[PDB]
């Protein structure tokens, strides 16, 4: 009775970071070894002993950001993505996996489908999700839902070109949160 990890990693479409997707994992047997021997994951950091420990629930978060933005997916980090899109807590107990996806996420002429949040009044508390499209009032005058001067649409596009530097290339990210509660654990290994 295996876990549906194929649904998360091998999916054809990933969500954009501002609308990062969350899949709940429960009541299955997970094989975590395939991570280590992959040797094709550019980022793999935890904050090998996974197959022996069980948890009541597992939460897999997935999205796409730039290469040089992957460093922001870590406890106590700052930046556009960490402040306005996806914030990891300080007490974070889990792992972060990321890999280059230029071949299947960019295209000649540019892929403008992956978005990111550029403006917000406050910062995001850990694991908060903001998907609002409210026009950002940057000036001292009301916007009334009309774009223009000092009134900006809060979401901007990435624009993934196949010929960009690795920093400006699309990268798919998976964040595994391990949850332990007063309840029977339902996600184990061998």
């Amino acid at each position, epitope marked *: 009775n295996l876990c549906p990890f194929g649904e998360v990693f091998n999916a054809t479409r990933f969500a954009s970071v501002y609308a990062w997707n969350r899949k709940r994992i429960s009541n299955c047997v997970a094989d975590y070894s395939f991570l280590y021997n992959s040797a094709s994951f550019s980022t793999f950091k935890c904050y090998t002993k996974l197959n022996d420990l069980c948890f009541t629930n597992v939460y897999a978060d997935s999205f796409v950001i730039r290469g040089d933005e992957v460093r922001q997916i870590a406890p106590g980090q700052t930046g556009k993505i960490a402040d306005y899109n996806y914030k990891l807590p300080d007490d974070f107990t889990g792992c972060v996996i990321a890999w280059n996806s230029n071949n299947l996420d960019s295209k000649v002429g540019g892929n403008y489908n992956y978005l990111y949040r*550029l403006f917000r009044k406050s910062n995001l508390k850990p694991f908060e999700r903001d998907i609002s499209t409210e026009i950002y009032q940057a000036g001292s005058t009301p916007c009334n839902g*009309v*774009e*223009g*001067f*000092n009134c*900006y649409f809060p979401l*901007q596009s990435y624009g993934f070109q196949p010929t960009n530097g690795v920093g400006y290339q699309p990268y798919r990210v998976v964040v595994l949160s391990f949850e332990l509660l007063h309840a029977p654990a339902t996600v184990c290994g061998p």
Partner: antibody
Amino acid sequence: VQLVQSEAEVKKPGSSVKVSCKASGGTYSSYAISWVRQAPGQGLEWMGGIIPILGIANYAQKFQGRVTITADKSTSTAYMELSSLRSEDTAVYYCARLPYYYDSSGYYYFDYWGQGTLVTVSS
Amino acid sequence: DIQMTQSPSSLSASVGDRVTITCRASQSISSYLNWYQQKPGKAPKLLIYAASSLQSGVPSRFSGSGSGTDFTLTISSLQPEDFATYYCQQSYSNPWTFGQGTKVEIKR
């Protein structure tokens, strides 16, 4: 001179034109660059703008789907491309500059205008 | 869409006169009002921003007053290089709107 524009253009109806605007300073700093046109014997009309330091572009409702304003930080040159040109589009296109007015927390006046680029659209 | 309406359309004056140009907004815009000068063939030049602040490099004889819906551009002791068209423009609400202009011509 603080902003220089490309020379005049003549375009057949239905084609597209791309006008340039170079900042004589070297960079954009925190300035905003907007495009305002003036038809023969008419007033001024805002069409769109860009804030290069932020990477944002807005456009007037009259020009959605036809205009695209871009910026190149390396050359410190701003571009405005207007598609599907019509006889009514024959006008002088100015690129104007807006500083961040701290006392009102935004861009609220045009500080310098380019000489203007004449675009003549006719069959 | 705020409609700025200027008065008068034309004005005939002599050198050394006190000239006042009034600009009325369809609704209150606080002090988000700018005055521009434009001469035939040339680009517009900023004169006054924030209804009353003088743009550096403009002679002190240019002064803006007013707030809310009524504004005034004042030129004390008109000079020869001041015969031109003057535009008022509001920055309160998008889209930004200009007036139809006021032309100051030599009187003879």
